[PDB]
């Protein structure tokens, strides 16, 4: 990182809360500005509402040029996310730009939770249930939300 990605982080933080998401939160864990942690609240009108999800954000030494290493610590019944919390979002590498911020990624996942990507499964069966029948999908998620995110 040198001192640049590092300042990039500071900027990412000082600006992160100038206008706080009132729903999500992220920041450096302990004395490591390259090791962050975040918390997302299930959008009130989504299957994951009322739940608290923990995320671990790892900043690449070459940031902001490369995307941040983030994982879902809290169990979540989502087709684009698996048993180890790995998240597969387009902007995480396939369509990522230095411009985008960690904040951005938050809202991205926030909407991703609401509107998932079925043909892009990380877990085929949960992606198949969504597509074939969301009515059932939107329950499992609730069951998991209060059993893993309460």
From Swiss-Prot:
The keyword Disulfide bond does not apply. It holds the Pfam family UQ_con. InterPro entries: UBQ-conjugat_E2_core (IPR000608), UBQ-conjugating_AS (IPR023313), UBQ-conjugating_enzyme/RWD (IPR016135). Ubiquitous. Up-regulated in livers of iron-overloaded patients with hereditary hemochromatosis. Its EC number is 2.3.2.23, 2.3.2.24. Pathway: Protein modification; protein ubiquitination. Changing residue 90 to R: Decrease in autoubiquitination. It catalyses: S-ubiquitinyl-[E1 ubiquitin-activating enzyme]-L-cysteine + [E2 ubiquitin-conjugating enzyme]-L-cysteine = [E1 ubiquitin-activating enzyme]-L-cysteine + S-ubiquitinyl-[E2 ubiquitin-conjugating enzyme]-L-cysteine; S-ubiquitinyl-[E1 ubiquitin-activating enzyme]-L-cysteine + [acceptor protein]-L-lysine = [E1 ubiquitin-activating enzyme]-L-cysteine + N(6)-monoubiquitinyl-[acceptor protein]-L-lysine. This is Ubiquitin-conjugating enzyme E2 D1. The gene is UBE2D1.
């Amino acid at each position: 990182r040198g001192s640049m990605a590092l300042k990039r982080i500071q900027k990412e933080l000082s600006d992160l809360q100038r206008d706080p998401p009132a729903h999500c939160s992220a920041g450096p864990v302990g004395d490591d500005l390259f090791h962050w942690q975040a918390t997302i609240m299930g959008p009130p009108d989504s299957a994951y509402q009322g739940g608290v999800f923990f995320l671990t954000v790892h900043f690449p030494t070459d940031y902001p040029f490369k995307p941040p290493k983030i994982a879902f610590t809290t169990k979540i019944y989502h087709p684009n996310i698996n048993s180890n919390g790995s998240i597969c979002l387009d902007i995480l590498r396939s369509q990522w730009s230095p411009a985008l911020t960690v904040s951005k990624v938050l809202l991205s996942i926030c909407s991703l939770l609401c509107d998932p990507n079925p043909d892009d499964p990380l877990v085929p069966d949960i992606a198949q249930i969504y597509k074939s029948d969301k009515e059932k999908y939107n329950r499992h998620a609730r069951e998991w939300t209060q059993k893993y995110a309460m």
